[PDB]
Design an enzyme around this catalytic site. Structure first.
Site, PDB file in Angstrom:
ATOM      1  N   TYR A   1      20.649   2.060  23.847  1.00  0.00           N
ATOM      2  CA  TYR A   1      19.703   1.528  22.649  1.00  0.00           C
ATOM      3  C   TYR A   1      18.422   1.328  23.627  1.00  0.00           C
ATOM      4  O   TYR A   1      18.320   0.944  24.578  1.00  0.00           O
ATOM      5  CB  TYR A   1      20.274   0.268  22.204  1.00  0.00           C
ATOM      6  CG  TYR A   1      19.394  -0.370  21.131  1.00  0.00           C
ATOM      7  CD1 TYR A   1      19.356   0.092  19.765  1.00  0.00           C
ATOM      8  CD2 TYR A   1      18.670  -1.729  21.527  1.00  0.00           C
ATOM      9  CE1 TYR A   1      18.439  -0.477  18.952  1.00  0.00           C
ATOM     10  CE2 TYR A   1      17.890  -2.264  20.298  1.00  0.00           C
ATOM     11  CZ  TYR A   1      17.790  -1.582  19.166  1.00  0.00           C
ATOM     12  OH  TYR A   1      16.921  -2.319  18.090  1.00  0.00           O
TER      13      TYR A   1
ATOM     14  N   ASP B   1      17.586  -5.292  26.204  1.00  0.00           N
ATOM     15  CA  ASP B   1      18.007  -5.640  24.962  1.00  0.00           C
ATOM     16  C   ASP B   1      19.280  -4.861  24.387  1.00  0.00           C
ATOM     17  O   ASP B   1      19.686  -4.105  25.152  1.00  0.00           O
ATOM     18  CB  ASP B   1      16.819  -5.225  23.756  1.00  0.00           C
ATOM     19  CG  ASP B   1      16.571  -3.926  23.994  1.00  0.00           C
ATOM     20  OD1 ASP B   1      17.250  -2.984  24.743  1.00  0.00           O
ATOM     21  OD2 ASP B   1      15.926  -3.107  22.861  1.00  0.00           O
TER      22      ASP B   1
ATOM     23  N   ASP C   1      33.501  25.899  27.858  1.00  0.00           N
ATOM     24  CA  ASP C   1      32.605  25.917  28.694  1.00  0.00           C
ATOM     25  C   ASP C   1      33.320  27.162  29.910  1.00  0.00           C
ATOM     26  O   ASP C   1      34.314  27.118  30.126  1.00  0.00           O
ATOM     27  CB  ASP C   1      32.555  24.677  29.587  1.00  0.00           C
ATOM     28  CG  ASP C   1      31.727  24.611  30.600  1.00  0.00           C
ATOM     29  OD1 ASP C   1      31.760  24.982  31.767  1.00  0.00           O
ATOM     30  OD2 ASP C   1      30.482  24.431  30.693  1.00  0.00           O
TER      31      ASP C   1
ATOM     32  N   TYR D   1      36.307  -2.657   3.967  1.00  0.00           N
ATOM     33  CA  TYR D   1      34.750  -2.460   4.927  1.00  0.00           C
ATOM     34  C   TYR D   1      33.895  -3.068   4.143  1.00  0.00           C
ATOM     35  O   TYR D   1      32.852  -2.267   3.566  1.00  0.00           O
ATOM     36  CB  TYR D   1      34.746  -0.998   5.473  1.00  0.00           C
ATOM     37  CG  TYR D   1      33.486  -1.089   6.386  1.00  0.00           C
ATOM     38  CD1 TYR D   1      34.029  -1.493   7.725  1.00  0.00           C
ATOM     39  CD2 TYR D   1      32.355  -0.811   6.312  1.00  0.00           C
ATOM     40  CE1 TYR D   1      33.193  -1.442   8.779  1.00  0.00           C
ATOM     41  CE2 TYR D   1      31.473  -0.546   7.158  1.00  0.00           C
ATOM     42  CZ  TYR D   1      31.813  -1.003   8.398  1.00  0.00           C
ATOM     43  OH  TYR D   1      30.767  -1.082   9.553  1.00  0.00           O
TER      44      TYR D   1
ATOM     45  N   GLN E   1      32.430  23.203  34.847  1.00  0.00           N
ATOM     46  CA  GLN E   1      31.177  22.278  35.350  1.00  0.00           C
ATOM     47  C   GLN E   1      30.429  21.831  34.115  1.00  0.00           C
ATOM     48  O   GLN E   1      29.659  22.665  33.408  1.00  0.00           O
ATOM     49  CB  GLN E   1      30.679  23.046  36.259  1.00  0.00           C
ATOM     50  CG  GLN E   1      31.352  23.507  37.477  1.00  0.00           C
ATOM     51  CD  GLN E   1      32.081  22.774  38.381  1.00  0.00           C
ATOM     52  OE1 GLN E   1      31.482  21.793  39.138  1.00  0.00           O
ATOM     53  NE2 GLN E   1      33.382  22.744  38.443  1.00  0.00           N
TER      54      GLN E   1
ATOM     55  N   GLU F   1      27.224  -7.719  25.211  1.00  0.00           N
ATOM     56  CA  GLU F   1      26.193  -7.251  24.348  1.00  0.00           C
ATOM     57  C   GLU F   1      26.711  -6.086  23.976  1.00  0.00           C
ATOM     58  O   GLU F   1      27.710  -5.481  24.474  1.00  0.00           O
ATOM     59  CB  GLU F   1      24.936  -6.996  25.105  1.00  0.00           C
ATOM     60  CG  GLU F   1      24.424  -8.276  25.680  1.00  0.00           C
ATOM     61  CD  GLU F   1      23.719  -9.069  24.770  1.00  0.00           C
ATOM     62  OE1 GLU F   1      22.650  -8.864  23.975  1.00  0.00           O
ATOM     63  OE2 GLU F   1      24.099 -10.317  24.594  1.00  0.00           O
TER      64      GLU F   1
ATOM     65  N   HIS G   1      34.009   1.018  20.395  1.00  0.00           N
ATOM     66  CA  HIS G   1      34.288   0.060  18.904  1.00  0.00           C
ATOM     67  C   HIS G   1      34.521   1.278  18.037  1.00  0.00           C
ATOM     68  O   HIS G   1      35.207   1.023  17.158  1.00  0.00           O
ATOM     69  CB  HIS G   1      32.442  -0.125  18.798  1.00  0.00           C
ATOM     70  CG  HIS G   1      32.241  -0.660  17.377  1.00  0.00           C
ATOM     71  ND1 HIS G   1      31.696  -1.824  17.093  1.00  0.00           N
ATOM     72  CD2 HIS G   1      32.027   0.155  16.142  1.00  0.00           C
ATOM     73  CE1 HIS G   1      31.362  -2.057  15.988  1.00  0.00           C
ATOM     74  NE2 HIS G   1      31.794  -0.968  15.348  1.00  0.00           N
TER      75      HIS G   1
HETATM   76 CA   LIG Z   1      17.023  -0.516  25.638  1.00  0.00          CA
HETATM   77 CA   LIG Z   2      27.986  -3.980  26.251  1.00  0.00          CA
HETATM   78 CA   LIG Z   3      29.357  24.906  32.504  1.00  0.00          CA
HETATM   79 ZN   LIG Z   4      31.699  -0.447  13.200  1.00  0.00          ZN
END
Ligand SMILES: [Ca+2]
Ligand SMILES: [Ca+2]
Ligand SMILES: [Ca+2]
Ligand SMILES: [Zn+2]
Ligand SMILES: N[C@@H](CCCC[NH3+])C(=O)O
Ligand SMILES: CC(C)[C@H](N)C(=O)O
Ligand SMILES: [Ca+2]
Length: 316
Positions: free
Chosen positions: A193, A200, A57, A157, A61, A187, A142
């Site tokens: 989202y 939600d 940049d 996994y 800013q 949540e 996360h």
């Molecule tokens: Ca939403």
């Molecule tokens: Ca949260």
């Molecule tokens: Ca800038």
């Molecule tokens: Zn994950």
């Protein structure tokens, strides 16, 4: 890159102004030298070649719309680093101050974020299901928590180990959200989202069933979708963690809450001392009981509450 440490200012995905640690060498780069071996944020330029270009940049800013996902990915990676260092005495995801790398503007309309084995990656969303996913501190934490897991327990996994892997990321994503203390909740992903729908989220730890996820082992998904339900069966463990912290009575089983800090200590110790790549839910229970025993003693309320919580979700 080599340069001098600077402090820029910008606006994140949700319109909030924040300061960011940058590095100056001709341009100002999203490179934070104040944490470990650095936090580096990259522009994937709507494509899928990673990492892309280290964000540069001209003026330090970062108020353009295009800048916002980078501001938040960079800033929230810093918060997450601070949480692991200050709360758990863990220096970056590998415990040895590994550089933390993130790319934003991944692909077009990409309704997800992930850890790819080496770095964090954030889509911009399609504007309807998601806005740029780095706007969610719980989402950033996360994803970085997957790196922690990958270096420590190494939970595969898939199936139950993968559901534990997911729950660990939701747990610490949430604990990081509380650590920053802006608008914290139990949540997942509510800040990014469905911008057209208020109230939600993608998952709920307090009530997983709100979004169709199981809250008891008897309701576990046993099919093959989603790597054997890793984002579905995580609800069973998320609910147990929520009960450990907050208490409640769930299918008639009462749990005495012990608070978020002790939840975090117990699960961090389980993750780093006891869980292995093949751990199943029963083995997580045993690891959490042992961790609470180590920290608080076999006769402690903390141990009793861990047992209550896993009882409540049907995990023996
Ligand atoms: Ca939403
Ligand atoms: Ca949260
Ligand atoms: Ca800038
Ligand atoms: Zn994950
Ligand atoms: N991260 C979760 C939920 C996000 C769904 C958005 N496409 C998954 O990949 O399944
Ligand atoms: C969107 C994010 C939280 C993650 N990739 C799922 O779940
Ligand atoms: Ca929140």
């Amino acid at each position: 890159i080599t340069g001098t440490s600077t402090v820029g200012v910008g606006r994140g995905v949700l319109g909030d102004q924040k300061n960011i640690n940058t590095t100056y060498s001709t341009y100002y780069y999203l490179q934070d030298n104040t944490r470990g071996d650095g936090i580096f944020t990259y522009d994937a330029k709507y494509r899928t070649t990673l990492p892309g270009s280290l964000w540069a940049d001209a003026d330090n800013q970062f108020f353009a719309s295009y800048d916002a996902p980078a501001v938040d990915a960079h800033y929230y990676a810093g918060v997450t680093y601070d949480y692991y260092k200050n709360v758990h005495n863990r220096l970056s995801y590998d415990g040895n101050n590994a550089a933390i790398r993130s790319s934003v503007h991944y692909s077009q309309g990409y309704n997800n974020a992930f850890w790819n084995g080496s770095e964090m990656v954030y889509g911009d969303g399609d504007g309807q299901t998601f806005i740029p996913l780095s706007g969610g501190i719980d989402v950033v934490a996360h994803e970085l928590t997957h790196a922690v897991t990958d270096y420590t327990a190494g939970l595969i996994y898939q199936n139950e180990s993968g559901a534990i892997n997911e729950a660990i990321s939701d747990i610490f994503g949430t604990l990081v959200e509380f650590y920053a203390n802006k608008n914290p909740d139990w949540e997942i992903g509510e800040d990014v989202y469905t911008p057209g729908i208020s109230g939600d989220s993608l998952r709920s730890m307090s009530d997983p069933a709100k979004y169709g996820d199981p809250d008891h082992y008897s309701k576990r998904y046993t099919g093959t979708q989603d790597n054997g339900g890793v984002h579905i069966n995580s609800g069973i463990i998320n609910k147990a963690a929520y009960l450990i912290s907050q208490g409640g009575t769930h299918y008639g089983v009462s749990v005495v809450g012990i608070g978020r800090d002790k939840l975090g200590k117990i699960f961090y110790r389980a993750l780093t001392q006891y869980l292995t790549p093949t751990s199943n839910f029963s083995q997580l229970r045993a690891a959490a009981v042992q961790s609470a025993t180590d920290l608080y003693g076999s006769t402690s309320q903390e141990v009793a509450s861990v047992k209550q919580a896993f009882d409540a979700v049907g995990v023996k």
